[PDB]
Amino acid sequence: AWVIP
Amino acid sequence: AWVIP
Amino acid sequence: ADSCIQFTRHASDVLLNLNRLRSRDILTDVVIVVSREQFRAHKTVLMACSGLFYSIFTDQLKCNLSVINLDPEINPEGFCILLDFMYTSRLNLREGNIMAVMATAMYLQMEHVVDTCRKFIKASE
Amino acid sequence: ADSCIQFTRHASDVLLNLNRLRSRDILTDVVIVVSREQFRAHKTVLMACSGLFYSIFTDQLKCNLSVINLDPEINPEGFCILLDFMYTSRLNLREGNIMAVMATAMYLQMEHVVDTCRKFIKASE
Ligand SMILES: CC(C)CCn1c(SCC(=O)Nc2ccccc2F)nc2nccnc2c1=O
Ligand SMILES: CC(C)CCn1c(SCC(=O)Nc2ccccc2F)nc2nccnc2c1=O
Numbered sequence: 001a002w003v004i005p
Numbered sequence: 006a007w008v009i010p
Numbered sequence: 011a012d013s014c015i016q017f018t019r020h021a022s023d024v025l026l027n028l029n030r031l032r033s034r035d036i037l038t039d040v041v042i043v044v045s046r047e048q049f050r051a052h053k054t055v056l057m058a059c060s061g062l063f064y065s066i067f068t069d070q071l072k073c074n075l076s077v078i079n080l081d082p083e084i085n086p087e088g089f090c091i092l093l094d095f096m097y098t099s100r101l102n103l104r105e106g107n108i109m110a111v112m113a114t115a116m117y118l119q120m121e122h123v124v125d126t127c128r129k130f131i132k133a134s135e
Numbered sequence: 136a137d138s139c140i141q142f143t144r145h146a147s148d149v150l151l152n153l154n155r156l157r158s159r160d161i162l163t164d165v166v167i168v169v170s171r172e173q174f175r176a177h178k179t180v181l182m183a184c185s186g187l188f189y190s191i192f193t194d195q196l197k198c199n200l201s202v203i204n205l206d207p208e209i210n211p212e213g214f215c216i217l218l219d220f221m222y223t224s225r226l227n228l229r230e231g232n233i234m235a236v237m238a239t240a241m242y243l244q245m246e247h248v249v250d251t252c253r254k255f256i257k258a259s260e
Contacts, residue, residue, distance in 0.1 A: 010014065
């Protein structure tokens, strides 16, 4: 996996 | 885009 | 073949276009009912994202249904957030919705979402 | 919302699962005929990848057809390679198939594929 898009 | 996978 | 070239952005572009078909209500083939709310979608996208929908739409009788009613304990906003995630890869996880999102992801059999919810809850705590 | 988190591998995982549905012939809803060959597929994936299929399956009469016949000048192997690319992001481009793949991509309105074909041809040259 999860990221800040 | 295009790459060698 | 082992000699293929790959277009990096292809999968993302397909998903964006599937979400544009959903927005335009093009080729949607099922209505998911969550208490008083209805959500139109494509069975193949649901099956590709959710173990529960894969089981439902591979059943020889339920594969033909145009309406599927979810358990009344499922929160409609939680379902809406997970349907948007299926079609976009983005999860609108907030303090005010995390418990409903996690419970909905457990029911839909979406383990990656359950895992991130558990991590965000553990961090607060 | 602007506060979403994103699962990087989601779009790729959805595409892999759509290709597994195609392999298993699950929920396929159209047969594309290319001369003597038939290919089963999902209309939504075709529409998400090809301008020609988007036009066909948004037409009020053709959206209901279960069989679509392509122009007899289209090469079946060229179509097979582009259908595999739609479902996997990988293009099996070879000296022996590039002209057929490029012509098929022009007909299906798949500009990125046309562009890479033109580049590989120009390099030889
Ligand atoms: C990797 C995983 C986290 C993806 C989400 N996912 C899924 S996605 C549904 C799926 O697997 N679709 C499918 C399978 C084979 C061929 C074509 C297909 F479209 N199914 C589950 N099933 C049981 C338990 N957990 C999961 C779970 O987490
Ligand atoms: C970016 C491009 C190279 C993708 C391939 N592609 C496509 S992909 C079909 C498409 O656009 N689908 C679609 C559109 C709106 C909403 C939902 C949808 F599923 N269409 C074309 N149309 C005319 C000319 N060229 C193209 C072309 O190259």
